[PDB]
Ligand binder design. Structure first.
Ligand SMILES: OC[C@H]1O[C@H](O)[C@H](O)[C@@H](O)[C@@H]1O
Length: 578
């Protein structure tokens, strides 16, 4: 009995939370009460199966159990609809139908959070319900969230409410903490979102390589066989999580932590404190842990990978292990290299041996492989230093606007809200990365940009509009950033006529958070660039300043939104001209 097994290992509290997540990610439109009903029914059934593994139905697949349980609700169509596709299917075509229907941008209310007293009132009232509702809302808005890590979020959320609904000042306590969690939430969601796209669109060989690269950077004293074994396990975990199998994913993640913590000596000397932690922190910790120190004596690659004969024989005899090995060996030596870079290098090596070992003088044409690495290392470095340079003059917000123009120019067809979200997360690289010394700049930055471009890739995927986005997103995961880089303003694109709509604002702008005000400015800038990509000196900065000044005047005009509408016909015309 699999469900009974997943009960025992996980315990009831984590069991229930995981189950709930699974339902809200499968059916994001569904109200809270229905999923709760479904969870308790599943827990109730699972308990009997721990009571007797021969009890009727306990032998069935988690998929069948969850699917059946789901279909008692999904079939109601003019309310749901296309999940009544899936309900008329049988396993395993149904599970895939559920997965294939995940929505990275579902038309759901953005959650405004109410005032603190009320929130604290809700927590003390029934704190189990409050937590469940927290999971419910995040999971359905992020159907690919690293489900085990979402438990950890819930844990810290609960700790914020337990502490903060006790002090002198509720809001001063809690609101900062909820913000730090909303910040990490977004990043964590996007991090996992890329892992699932590696697996789903490029297959496990691609993921495995990514893994070897990254774990070798992290665990460089560890031998290749130890790395391979962690890599097999890490992949099994993510493969399960990206596929909706949350239960096994949590269970296999705990096991992976047990394993790692018992073998610290073969692995890294930084695990000390992660391994002292409780179950959830423990995994979270490991995943976040800084690189171990490099083995001080390390021999040059050349001996076994260029100078040697048997290069071609090893290549052919065992290509996957030989290539893993190159990548491990080169990875452990360059924690100052982004993972996308190192996989780029390793693809370059392969292709070279490919063509070279097609024997005329193999030992010759592949003698200068490392020669091809030169340009590949330099392209990122220059862009990183340069964009960090541009950021220092500008700061985060002004750095965001520059990107906004850059990428809207690049791919003008992409929805406005998408551009704004993407460019702002793109600008957030400067804050996270340029702070660092060059030792840490490139991984930080180019790896971060993978995450953010992958966001643009999936958001755009839902309703495709620009052939250059689709092309860069399909082409090759490893190449995505360069692909977007090499792109320049679009000639094909027929500039947008013009809207009075899109440049008249309303008096609600005078009371918005600095955050929301930025987003509104940016939204208008995109729309601007969309109207005039070809032409765009400083003439954009003139227009944006003409907007900001009408906004200064109109927010101090104190009337009933009148100059927003009066000066709102005035200036719409004026900006097409200037
Ligand atoms: O991909 C994230 C993972 O990284 C770590 O190496 C551990 O494998 C795991 O517990 C964590 O989830």
């Amino acid at each position: 009995s699999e469900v009974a097994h997943r009960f025992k290992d996980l315990g009831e509290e984590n069991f229930k939370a995981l189950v709930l997540i699974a339902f809200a990610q499968y059916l994001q439109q569904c109200p809270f009460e229905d999923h709760v009903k479904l969870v308790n029914e599943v827990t109730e059934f699972a308990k009997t199966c721990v009571a007797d593994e021969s009890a009727e139905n306990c032998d069935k697949s988690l998929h069948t159990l969850f699917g059946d349980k789901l279909c008692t609700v999904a079939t109601l169509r003019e309310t749901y609809g296309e999940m009544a596709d899936c309900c008329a299917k049988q396993e395993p075509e149904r599970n895939e139908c559920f997965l294939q229907h995940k929505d990275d941008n579902p038309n759901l209310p953005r959650l405004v959070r109410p005032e603190v007293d009320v929130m604290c009132t809700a927590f003390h009232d029934n704190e189990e319900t409050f937590l469940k509702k927290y999971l419910y809302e995040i999971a359905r808005r992020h159907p690919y969230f690293y489900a085990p890590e979402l438990l950890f979020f819930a844990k810290r959320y609960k700790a914020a409410f337990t502490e903060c609904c006790q002090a002198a000042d509720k809001a001063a306590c809690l609101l900062p903490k909820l913000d730090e969690l909303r910040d990490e939430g977004k990043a964590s969601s996007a991090k996992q979102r890329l892992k699932c796209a590696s697996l789903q669109k490029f297959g496990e060989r691609a993921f495995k390589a990514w893994a070897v690269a990254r774990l070798s950077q992290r665990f460089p004293k560890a031998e290749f066989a130890e790395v391979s074994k962690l890599v097999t396990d890490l992949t099994k975990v993510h493969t399960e999580c990206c596929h909706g199998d949350l239960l096994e994913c949590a269970d296999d993640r705990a096991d992976l932590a047990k394993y790692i913590c018992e073998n610290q000596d073969s692995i890294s000397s930084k695990l000390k404190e992660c391994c002292e932690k409780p179950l959830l922190e423990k995994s979270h910790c490991i995943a976040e842990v800084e690189n171990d120190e490099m083995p001080a004596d390390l021999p040059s690659l050349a001996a076994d990978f260029v100078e040697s004969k048997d290069v071609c024989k090893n290549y052919a005899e065992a290509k996957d292990v030989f290539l893993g090995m190159f990548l491990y060996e080169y990875a452990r030596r360059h924690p100052d290299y982004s993972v996308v870079l190192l996989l780029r290098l390793a693809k370059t090596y392969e292709t070279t041996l490919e063509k070279c070992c097609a024997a005329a003088d193999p030992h010759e044409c592949y003698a200068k492989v490392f020669d091809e690495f030169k340009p590949l290392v330099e392209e990122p470095q220059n862009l990183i230093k340069q964009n960090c340079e541009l950021f220092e003059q500008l700061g985060e917000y002004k750095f965001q606007n520059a990107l906004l123009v850059r990428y809207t120019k690049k791919v003008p067809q992409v929805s406005t809200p998408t551009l704004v979200e993407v460019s702002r997360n793109l600008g957030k690289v400067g804050s996270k990365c340029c702070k660092h010394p060059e030792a840490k700049r490139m991984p930080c930055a180019e790896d971060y940009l993978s995450v953010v471009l992958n966001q643009l890739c999936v958001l755009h995927e839902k309703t495709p509009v620009s052939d250059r986005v689709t092309k860069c997103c399909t082409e090759s995961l490893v190449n995505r950033r360069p692909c977007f880089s090499a792109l320049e303003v679009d000639e094909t694109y027929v500039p947008k006529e013009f809207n009075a709509e899109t440049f008249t604002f309303h008096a609600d702008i005078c009371t918005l958070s600095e955050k929301e005000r930025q987003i509104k400015k940016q939204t208008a800038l995109v729309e601007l660039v969309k109207h005039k990509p070809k032409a765009t000196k400083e003439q954009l900065k003139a227009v944006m300043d003409d907007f900001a000044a009408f906004v200064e005047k109109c927010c101090k005009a104190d009337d009933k939104e009148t100059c927003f509408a009066e000066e709102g016909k005035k200036l719409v015309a004026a900006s097409q001209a200037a």
